[model samples]
Target: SNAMDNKALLSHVDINNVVCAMPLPYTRLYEGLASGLKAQFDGIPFYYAHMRGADIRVECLLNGVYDMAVVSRLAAESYLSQNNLCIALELGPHTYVGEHQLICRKGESGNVKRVGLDSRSADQKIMTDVFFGDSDVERVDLSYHESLQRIVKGDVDAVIWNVAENELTMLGLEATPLTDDPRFLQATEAVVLTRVDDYPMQQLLRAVVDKHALLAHQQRVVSGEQEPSY
Candidate 1:
């Protein structure tokens, strides 16, 4: 009983084991976390993994292998419904889950037959599922750059990705965003998530997050003020 009342809880926290995961192409997140932590902490102290899916990243967090992660707000909230011990911190409404866009080869825009899919990303799965509607199309899960090139090579027909991301512009593909269709035109921003009881991590994460910097840097890259990076 006395242990719960003492300062040991705060003093004994091991700050060294701060492992974190970020969804695929974590460069933005890497920069974001660093921007905030630079002022308050020794460095960007996270032992990091930039992974493909929100599930696997969040899974690692729940099992204790990772202390934190950046995932879609939907993924975090969906996971939180069943896992009460988790916490989801929305990065910023201005911040997006991704600057999502549909890219297709120059010749075959409306005639898409084969669509590239990131099987692990919830938004990719759900958005493609709805937009394509239950009509039937070959959903191909494959490499980003490779699949993207497939569009150019005339092997694959379409892929929804971040605008100008992952060699798209360099490859000279058209970028698309904002559907004029009044049905569905949106999705969740990413969240900084962790276990609810991870006190040390929670404390430090709160201290070292600068989403204002996060959003600004994101715009710079998207707007060509900064080079396209991971």
Candidate 2:
């Protein structure tokens, strides 16, 4: 276990062979990893698949298609419980904490009867499920942008959106925090997942995790600041 040993480990896995799966694009988590890999892997070339949903990302990692992934807590837990081949590890709570809000058309926040839910997103659904509870709020499956547009067109009363995507004024809508009624008051979490016994991939992940650069990039993504080039 010296420098040569580590370099030997690095050589065992070609950087070109690494593939990291994640849920959704244009979010802090993805951007952060993009930055982290650049810093940690240096000239290493890898594939970063921005899957449409957490479940899909989880499925990819569990099926051995992906070397590693960034996935929601629920998806990771679901997989970890049934599959021993994939391991879940928390990078940090705030690194991928999912903060969500309820968005509605102007002056229509009150008396909302119908709401659009993005069926592709696991986090949004959790927020919607908790916010509406057993109360009567008709849930309609729609794209994220479509949900917002529906609210504007008065087709739906409101929609739950990620706080990261919050631009209510720009969208001609307003956002209300579900903080008071949320089941996850502290916010839901995302975690790092890897194929069990993939030591080289796991070694690279540990280096990035120790550097903690991903969380820094995540902060920039969340704050609307310019992102680091990967």
Q: State which candidate has the highest lDDT.
A: 2
Model 2 clashes, total count: 0
The lDDT of each candidate is 0.62, 0.67
Q: Which lDDT tens digits does candidate 1 get at residues 1-230?
A: 33232233335567554666875454554444333333223344445576767778877888887888876654565677777445635655435444567788654567888988877667677667767877667988966576787888888888877665456657767766746432223344656778888877776655554556656666666555665332
Q: What TM-score do all the candidates reach, one by one?
A: 0.64, 0.71
Clashes of each: 0, 0
What stretches of model 1 exceed 4 Å from their correct place? 1-9, 12-16, 23-29, 37-52, 81-85, 93-98, 120-123, 164-173, 180-188, 196-230
Question: Which residue pairs in model 2 clash with each other?
Answer: none
- Backbone clashes in candidate 1 total 0
Candidate with best TM-score: 2
